[PDB]
């Protein structure tokens, strides 16, 4: 019922903007809110009345309004920035409205290359008949990444499972996973995950004899 | 710009009310003076009359919502939530408080959640001061520490305004209007 | 000290009900407009409804036939009962206070509840399995192998230990369960005398599980 740009971005120091479309129903009678969000976090209001901010807001976030459009401006941007922002608005059904947010990425930083650390399996999964490789990767930006495992320098990705985010380190992490029988494990002489970041790949092994 | 003020589509808040430089237009005040739209329309230091024959530094026109009751508070020397912490006349003020129903305009079913106006303050107003912070209000003797517990409230409220009310209840608009002279009361020449 | 813990979530049959609450307790409850909002994981927060400091209920037009919000201001609780559970209906469902006072019911006011997650799917709750990942430092960890759904607590010596910690985020197999693993960093020469423990709770499965890590 409310639109937002689903991305922004912005290099630190700069200004970045948001938009807000509405309807006659909401933003053109009624103010508008914006809230930022951090990562699965409960969300935090910043903006109330179009352009008035709840105490311990910055005064570089900067609410507008005019007709059924609205806009969110953050001056000076800071890596703590990079957020989810939704804008609200009720509407005169008797509703209340989230846009449908737009994540705000910080653009300025240094790449980094990946940490990779594989676990054998645990001779305790072994006993429970299962096999799982466990291959970690951290510290690296940006944040795509390939990653390629390799039974006896052969190519496998029959039980491969994998994912991407960023973490406390505004460094990315992601987690691998290799899913093997014991007979697989045993049979074979090396496994190795090999993980390509800008380029350069880097890759760990593990064998059976260790 | 008398456009721009009675027939905004769109009033302010009365603890964030609205400004305008007049000062310099050309302004029959006796027009409005007869409207009889106007369900209020007193003048201070200065009669209807003569109104135009004052002399000045500068004029201003304030603006904001106010729910029915409430009007009479917008005058020199009064008392209560609205002359205490939100629009503050001074004792020795020349000009006009303009005063309507705007039932209208300003309600809706439901309840309109908009108009606003500050419900606690630590000191009461300065006259035509300002104030539109919303720090925690301490209204007990344990400090809130930057939270909103038990005695801590966010120091503003909403009227709410529906069609139904009573009419004591309904929404007002306002404009006060204000003559300066270099931060004094003006004059007739 | 102002609180708003919730529960009632976890996995539901589709088209089957389910009972919300979210406890408050370091302010005045019974002054104050309560509003739900859920959010679909990866997705924009959605509002669901609000009731007023008593009796004036409003709902999104999603839910509108489905969802009833309650109040107990004697017991300082809020409550939402879900009916006809569809699978799209899956989400973090947030408590949240309104701004201010009485009328001033919206916009909602960054005081919110913790989140619990609810499931609609046929899906059975599974427990984890617990694998110790055994090790100028050393890496050693826990597999936390097999469960459904999330999520999983994590910690290490009971929470004593947090340098170098770092639990990723879950994977999920084609199975339909997670799979999460959690590592922790450690000089190498700290093997011979101190111990890690890592400490595995699944709510949604009740189950508590400790794994100590050794050297091989």
């Known amino acids: 019922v409310l639109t937002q740009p689903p991305s922004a971005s912005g290099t630190p120091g700069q200004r970045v903007t948001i938009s807000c479309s509405g309807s006659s129903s909401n933003i053109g009678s009624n103010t508008v809110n914006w809230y930022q969000q951090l990562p699965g976090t409960a969300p935090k209001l910043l903006i109330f009345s179009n352009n008035q901010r709840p105490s311990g807001v910055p005064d570089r976030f900067s609410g507008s309004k005019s007709g059924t459009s609205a806009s969110l401006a953050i001056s000076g941007l800071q890596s703590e920035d990079e957020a989810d922002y939704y804008c609200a608005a009720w509407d005169d059904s008797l509703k209340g409205v989230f846009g449908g947010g737009t994540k705000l990425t910080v653009l300025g930083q240094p790449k980094a290359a990946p940490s990779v650390t594989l676990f054998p399996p645990s001779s305790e999964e072994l006993q429970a008949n299962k096999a799982t490789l466990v291959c970690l990767i951290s510290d690296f930006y940006p944040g795509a990444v390939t990653v390629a495992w390799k039974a006896d320098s052969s190519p496998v990705k029959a039980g491969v499972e994998t994912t991407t985010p960023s973490k406390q380190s505004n460094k990315y992490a992601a987690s691998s996973y290799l899913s093997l029988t014991p007979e697989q494990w045993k049979s074979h002489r090396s496994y190795s995950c090999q993980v390509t970041h800008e380029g350069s790949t880097v890759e760990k092994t593990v064998a059976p004899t260790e | ?189 | 000290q102002v609180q708003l813990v919730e529960s009632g979530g976890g996995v539901v049959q589709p088209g089957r009900s389910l009972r919300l609450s979210c406890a408050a307790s370091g302010f005045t409850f019974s002054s104050y407009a309560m509003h739900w909002v859920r959010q679909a994981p990866g997705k924009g927060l959605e509002w669901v409804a609000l009731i007023s400091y008593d009796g004036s209920n409003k709902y999104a037009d999603s839910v509108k036939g489905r969802f009833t919000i309650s109040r107990d201001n004697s017991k300082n609780t809020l409550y939402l009962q879900m009916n006809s559970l569809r699978a799209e209906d899956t989400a973090v469902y947030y408590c949240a206070r309104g701004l201010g006072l009485r009328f001033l019911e919206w916009p909602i006011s960054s005081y919110w509840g913790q989140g619990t997650l609810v499931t609609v799917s046929s899906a059975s709750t599974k427990g984890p399995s617990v694998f110790p990942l055994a090790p100028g430092t050393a890496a050693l960890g826990c597999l936390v192998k097999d469960y459904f759904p999330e999520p999983v607590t994590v910690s290490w010596n009971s929470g004593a230990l947090t340098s170098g910690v770092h639990t990723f985020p879950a994977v999920l197999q084609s199975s339909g369960l997670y799979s999460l693993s959690s590592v922790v960093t450690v000089p190498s020469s700290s093997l011979g005398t101190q111990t890690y423990i890592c400490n595995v709770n699944h709510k949604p499965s009740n189950t508590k599980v400790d794994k100590r890590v050794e050297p091989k």
């Open chain 2, 1 to 189: 710009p008398f456009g721009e003020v009675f027939n905004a589509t769109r009033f302010a808040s009365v603890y964030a009310w609205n400004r305008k430089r007049i000062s310099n237009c050309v302004a029959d005040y006796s027009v409005l003076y007869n409207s009889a739209s106007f369900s209020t329309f007193k003048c201070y230091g200065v009669s209807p009359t003569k109104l135009n024959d004052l002399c000045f530094t500068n004029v201003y026109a304030d603006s904001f919502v106010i729910r029915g009751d409430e009007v009479r508070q917008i005058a020199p020397g009064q008392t209560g939530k609205i002359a205490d912490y939100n629009y503050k006349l001074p004792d020795d003020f020349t000009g006009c408080v303009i005063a309507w129903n705007s039932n209208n305009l300003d309600s809706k079913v439901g309840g309109n959640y908009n108009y606003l106006y500050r419900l606690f303050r630590k000191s009461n107003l300065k006259p035509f001061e300002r104030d539109i912070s919303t720090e925690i209000y301490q209204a007990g003797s344990t400090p809130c520490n930057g939270v909103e517990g038990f005695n801590c409230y966010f120091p503003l409220q909403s009227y709410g305004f529906q069609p139904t009310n009573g009419v004591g209840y309904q929404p007002y608009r306002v404009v006060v209007l204000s003559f300066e002279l270099l931060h004094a009361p003006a004059t007739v020449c």
